[PDB]
Amino acid sequence: EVAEEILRLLREHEELLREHERLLKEARELAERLEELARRLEELARRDEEAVRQVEEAAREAERVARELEKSARRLQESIRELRRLLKELRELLRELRKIAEELERIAEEAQRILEETERILRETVRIAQEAVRLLQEARRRAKGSEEIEKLAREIKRAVEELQKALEENERAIRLNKEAARKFEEAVE
Known part of the structure; x- marks a missing residue:
């Protein structure tokens, strides 16, 4: 039964992986769209209903992408939680017992720490996505002086930088989850 429990955990990790890959895509597009709006805002400060219109349309679409980023990280x-509920059922099954079971508890205990670190990354990604939504909503309200448009453009560019740091940490958490799953395959073989 322990062997069948790992295989169900591996299937869940696979669906975890493709959803986390989708998270990277949404966050990569948001950062690109936020950098573009920042440049459009700095043009609006120096300059036009088209310049206001393109700021409104660039922020409105960047807000839709931030919502998808938030929905994907929430998912x-x-x-x-599903992985850890399957993990506790495995913890008790392997402790029912063999040296193979002893190896499975070291890689399962490590997988616990990775999932905890992974959810801490996702919670920070939700925060940056929520900060992006508020800044985008502020960009559309102000576009309806130059000094206030410049500061908002600078604040958006700082959100880009922490979004890029969240990209690195999410890509790191994916690797650690992939490597933890590879150990589950070889140890159960």
Whole structure:
């Protein structure tokens, strides 16, 4: 039964992986769209109903992408709970017992720490996505002086930088989850 429990956990990790890959895509597009709006805002400060219109349309679409980023990270968080619920059922099954079971408890205990670190990454990604939504909503209200448009453009560019740091940490958490799953395959073989 322990062998069948790992295989179900591996299937869940696979669905975890493709949802986390979708999270990277949404966050990569948001950062690109936020950098573009920042440049459009700095042009609006120096300059036009088209310049106001393109700021409104660039922010409105960047807000839709930030919502998808938030929805994807929320979906990943409710699935780490599934992984850990499957993990506790495995913890008791392997402790029913053999040296193979002793190896499975070191890689399962490590997988616990990775999932905890992974959800801490996702919670920070939700925060940056929520900060992006508020800044985008502020960009559309102000576009309806130059000094205030410049500061908002600078604040958006700082959100880009922490979004890029969240990209690195999410890509790192994917590797650690992939490597933890590879150990489950070889140890159960």
